[PDB]
Amino acid sequence: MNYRELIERARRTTAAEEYDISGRYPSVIAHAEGAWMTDLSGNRYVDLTGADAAVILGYRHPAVNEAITRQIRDYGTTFASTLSVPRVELAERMCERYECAEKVVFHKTGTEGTAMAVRLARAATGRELVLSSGYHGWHEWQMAGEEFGYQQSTGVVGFGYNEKALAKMLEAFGEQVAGVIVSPEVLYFDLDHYRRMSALCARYDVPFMLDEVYTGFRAGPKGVHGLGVPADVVVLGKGLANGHSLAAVMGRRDIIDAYDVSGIQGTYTREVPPMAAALAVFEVLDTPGVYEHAEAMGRRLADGMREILTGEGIPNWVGGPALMFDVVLPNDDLGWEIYKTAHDFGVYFEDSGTQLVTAAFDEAAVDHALTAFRKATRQVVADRPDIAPTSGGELTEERKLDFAEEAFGGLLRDDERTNALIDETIEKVVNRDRSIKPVLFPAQN
Amino acid sequence: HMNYRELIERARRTTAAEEYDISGRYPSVIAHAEGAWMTDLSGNRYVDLTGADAAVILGYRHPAVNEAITRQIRDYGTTFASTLSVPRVELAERMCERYECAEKVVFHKTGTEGTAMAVRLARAATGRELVLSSGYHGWHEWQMAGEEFGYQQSTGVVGFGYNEKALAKMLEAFGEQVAGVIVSPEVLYFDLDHYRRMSALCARYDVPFMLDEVYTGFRAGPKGVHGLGVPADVVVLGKGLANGHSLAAVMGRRDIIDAYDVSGIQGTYTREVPPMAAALAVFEVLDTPGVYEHAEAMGRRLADGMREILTGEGIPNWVGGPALMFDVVLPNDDLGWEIYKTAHDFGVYFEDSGTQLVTAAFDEAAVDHALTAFRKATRQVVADRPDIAPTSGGELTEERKLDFAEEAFGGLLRDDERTNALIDETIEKVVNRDRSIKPVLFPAQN
Lengths: 445, 446
Ligand SMILES: *Cc1c(COP(=O)(O)O)cnc(C)c1O
Ligand SMILES: *Cc1c(COP(=O)(O)O)cnc(C)c1O
Prior knowledge:
2 copies of one chain form a homodimer.
Chain A: H1 3-13, H2 17-22, E1 29-33, E2 36-39, E3 44-47, H3 62-74, H4 85-97, E4 103-107, H5 110-125, E5 129-133, H6 140-145, E6 149-151, E7 156-158, H7 163-173, E8 177-182, H8 191-203, E9 208-212, H9 223-226, E10 233-236, E11 247-251, H10 253-256, H11 259-262, H12 273-285, H13 290-311, E12 317-319, E13 325-328, H14 334-343, E14 347-348, E15 354-355, H15 363-383, H16 397-408, H17 416-430
Parallel strand pairs in A: 3-14, 5-7, 5-8, 8-9, 9-10
Antiparallel strand pairs in A: 1-2, 2-3, 4-11, 6-7, 10-11, 12-13, 13-15
Helix pairs in contact in A: 3-12, 4-12, 7-8, 7-17, 13-15, 14-15
C-alpha cells in the first residue's frame, strides 16, 4: 500500500483524523533502524521526534532487541506470578542507580505511572490534596492540573510552576497536601528552581514527586533527579525500555509500600520482556562515552539550527538540554510550516519544537537534518514572508512569557493577573466545604 | 534469583507489594512456561489454570504469537514516529469485520485505560455527564467506587449492581444526563438475555451501552458476550487480546470512537506495533476451525471432573458458567482457597478466586493432572479442616448464593425492602443534587 491507500483504510477503521493523520506528516513508517526511518514507498527520513520521545537509544537497538526477544522466546512474557527474575534485577539496578529509589514498581504507561504516584502519596500520608505543575497524562484530573487553580472534585491544585504560589499554598494548607508532582521544565528554569521546590516541600513534610516520564533520560542519564534534585518519588516512562511499553514509580520505601492499601493493580504490570529491555537500556546508558556522544550530537544539531535561524534574521531562542532542546520562535505558525516542509527533504522534526536526538545519531544524520532545515527554512521564508519576521531582532519578553503559559502552563509573571490567580486559588481551597472530597482509596471521607 | 526464598527476599527489599506480590500468591515464582505448563525457579512444573490471571488465552509461548511479535520487533521496529502502521490497520480491519458493533477501533495498553477511554469517548460523543456502571473496570477510584451501588457526584458514576429494576428507573429519572452504561458481564448468575435487556433499555433512551469485555472477551466465547448476540455500542477488550503481551482495544460505533480527537485521549505507547502483530495472530488462531471448540472441551472436562470430585467428598457445590471461565462455588469463602493452596504442592496453579481458566494449549493429560491434584488436595483439606469442609451432601443455600453474588461482584439480586430503598435513595440523590457541582470533564460540560 502507499500513503493515500493506507490512510483511507485507516480513516474507515481506526484513525483519529487529527491525532493520527492531519496532525502528522504525510507518511507512515514501515521500518526504522538507528536514526533513520523508511516509509511505505521507501522514502527515508532522519527522526528527530524520538518516536515522540518513546525512544532514547535509537530504533531497533540490537542489545535491547536481543534482551526482549530472548525473554519472549526462551522464557515467556506474562506469567501467573507477578514477580520474575528480570523484575527483581531491574528493581535492584534502579535502586542502586537512583538516590530516591528505595523501592520501585512498574506499569505500562506514564499516565498510569503518575496516577500511581499520586495514589501512593495519598495512601501513605492519608492527606487529600495534590499540587501539580506540568503534563502528567490524559486523565481529566491530570489535564486540569496543568491549569492554575483548584478542582475540588479531583483534589488537585495546579500551581503553574510558580514558586510564590507553591510557597503560599504550603503555608496556607500544607497540612492537607499529600504530594507535589512536577514535570521538570528546564528551558525556562534551572536546577536550583527544582532544588528550592524540593526543599520547600521537605520543610512542610510534603512528598516531592518528579514526573520524569519525559525528562528521565533526556535531561541527563539519570534525569533531573540525578543532576542533584532530591525527591521522594520519581516517575519514568519515555525511553525506559527504548520504545517498548514500560513505566516505573521509584521512591521512598513507605510510599511504595502503600501499594497494597492503595488498591493499585494491573494485569500487564508483571509483563517481563520490557523489563529485560530496560535493563539493557540502563547498561547502554552507563557505557562510557555513549551518553556524552548523544549529547554532542544534540548540541551539534541545536547549534546548527540556531545559526540557520539567526542567519535568516528570524528572532529565536534555542536552548535547554542537548537531548531535549527547544526551538522557540516569534509565533506558533512558523515552526510547523518549516517542519512540514522539511519532511519533503527527508527529516521528521518534532513539530512542537523540542528536538530529540537519540544515541544512534552520527554527524552525518545531524548534518542531513541541518541541510534539510536550512533548505526548508529558506523555502518557507521565500514563499511566506509574512510568516516570519526577518529583521534580525530577538524574541520579545512578552512572547517568551506568553509561550511559557501556552506551552506548559507556566505562570512566570509577577503581574496583577497572576497574583490575582494565586489569591483566588488559595481562598477557594481554604474556604471550601470540607465535607466534599474526591473519591479516594483508601477513603479519607 | 535462584530459588524462591532468595527471590522474595530480594523482591521485598526493592519492588514487592507484600500482599499483592508475595503473601497473596502461591509460594513459587515462574521462570519459564510453555503451553499449559509453567516451571518455577527450582524446576518444579505446574499446570496453569489462572491463564496468567486471564492475560493468556492460547497458552504460553504460542509459536504463531512468538513468530509474529519477534518478526515485528526484529525486522521492522516497535514504536515509530507515525501512530499509524500497517499492522495497526490490518488489525483494525480484522476487528471491524469480526465484530458487529465494531465500526472503528482504537488501542491502548491496559484494560483499565481501555474502560477509561470508553467512558471518556461516550461523554465526549454525547456531551452528557453521568455514567451508570456494573462490575470491575480497573483500579482508578471512579472505577472501583462504581462497583458499589450508589452515586458519587465527584466522579459522575452511579453503580447499579447489575439490577435491571434499578437501571430502568435510573434511565427514566435522569437518563437525559447519562453518557453511557458500562457493564462487565457476569454470566454465572445472569444469562445473555439479562444483558440484551440492559442493551435494549439503553437504546430506548439513546444511551450508549458499553460492554467491558476485558475479562470475558475470549472466554465467554471466541467473540465474547457481544458475539453471542448481545448488541452494544462499545466493547472493551484486553485480557487475552495479545496472548499475554500488553494490548487493549476499544471498538464500537463510529460516532463514539470518532470523539477521540476532542476527548484528549492519547498515550505514547498506544501506537506500539509488536502487540498488534501478536493480536492479529491471536485472532487467526481463535478463528482456526476446531481450536476454540477443543479448548471448550478441555474446560468442560475440567469442570465436570472438579464437580465430581467435590460431590464425591460430599461437599455442597455449584460448578457452572462458560467452559473457558467456569466458577467453583463452595459453601464458604475459605474452603476453595485452602484446597487451591494445597494443590500447588501437587503441580497446579488453580485460580484462587474460583474461576478456572483453561487455554487452547490444554490436552487431556494437562486437565487430568489438574484433576488428580484437585482430588488429592481436596481429600487432604477435608481431612484436616472440618471447620470449613462440610461433607454431608446437599446444595448451596439460596442465602449463600445471594450473599456470594453481592460480595464477589456487587450484584444486588434480592427483591426486598432494603434493595428497593437503596434504589430509591440513590435516584433521589442524583435528581436532587446541586447541579453546579460536576466532575472535571474534557471537553468541559460546564
Ligand atoms: C508522556 C508524558 C506522560 C504520559 O505518559 P504516557 O506513556 O504517554 O501515558 C506523563 N508525564 C510526562 C511529563 C510526559 O511527557
Ligand atoms: C482486568 C479487568 C480490567 C482491567 O484490566 P487491566 O489490564 O488489568 O488494567 C477491566 N475490566 C475487567 C472486567 C477486567 O477483568
